[PDB]
Design an enzyme around this catalytic site. Sequence first.
Site, short mmCIF file in Angstrom:
data_model
loop_
_atom_site.label_atom_id
_atom_site.label_comp_id
_atom_site.label_asym_id
_atom_site.label_seq_id
_atom_site.Cartn_x
_atom_site.Cartn_y
_atom_site.Cartn_z
CG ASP A 64 -2.12 2.31 6.31
OD1 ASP A 64 -2.15 2.07 5.09
OD2 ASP A 64 -2.53 3.39 6.80
CG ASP B 276 -1.88 1.17 1.24
OD1 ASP B 276 -2.62 1.36 0.25
OD2 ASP B 276 -1.88 1.91 2.24
CG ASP C 50 -1.84 7.77 0.39
OD1 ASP C 50 -0.89 8.59 0.33
OD2 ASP C 50 -2.70 7.67 -0.51
#
EC number: 3.1.3.12
Length: 246
Positions: free
Chosen positions: A198, A20, A22
């Site tokens: 996240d 991922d 961001d």
Amino acid sequence: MAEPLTVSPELTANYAYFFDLDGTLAEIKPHPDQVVVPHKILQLLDRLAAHNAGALALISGRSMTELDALAKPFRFPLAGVHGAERRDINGKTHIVRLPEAVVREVEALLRSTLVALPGTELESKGMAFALHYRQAPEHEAALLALAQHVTQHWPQLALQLGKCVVEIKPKGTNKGEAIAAFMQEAPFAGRIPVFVGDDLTDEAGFGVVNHAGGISVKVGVGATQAAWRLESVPDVWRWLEQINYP
Ligand SMILES: OC[C@H]1O[C@H](O[C@H]2O[C@H](CO)[C@@H](O)[C@H](O)[C@H]2O)[C@H](O)[C@@H](O)[C@@H]1O
Ligand SMILES: [Cl-]
Ligand SMILES: [Mg+2]
């Protein structure tokens, strides 16, 4: 439940990597345009991909153009808009397309409903709509409810909540199926999947990576079904540097 990740794989092992962006490769910012992936991190990612036959992809909620802007000058395999956009190793792109009338009507509805919630932002992604509320979190409930109505009236659409955002995506689009699409193609096929994320959208990925006997890594705090955890984004950077130079 998740255990701390303190070991880093060998550089030339049999792994396929999925990251991922961001909150995983770049630190969270008050505004999306302020986000930067440090150039050394991009170099480390390029070297990792190179030593693993190019089996490294960026799986993100961003559009593929913004991923290209963030990873410039490097061009990785991509999955954007939580999987509604994808680009494989050969550069071929796959875009999920919504009917034009649905996009028009939903965009108009959201734009009109947004006036009574100042500070919220509506980001149109072609086949999705992100409702940002980081500048005004008090509207978090309202937006949510509003999105829940859209998905009720347009069954082509599904909900994807996330850190300071409520996104409306095409139904069936998720990071798990994006990782699945990558894992049945060269050069990812035959390798062990590794996925670092996240947010809630990443949990799907974690799931499909755990069922496949791979390695799922959660970044930051919060409950997760990932088997491993990293404390912060700088810890992801240190993990990558340890992979490249033990
Ligand atoms: O970290 C900066 C921004 O990250 C998030 O926004 C990005 O991630 C979302 C994933 O759902 C996308 O929808 C969005 O288009 C991206 O900009 C976060 O939502 C923002 O508040 C942050 O400013
Ligand atoms: Cl995301
Ligand atoms: Mg994230």
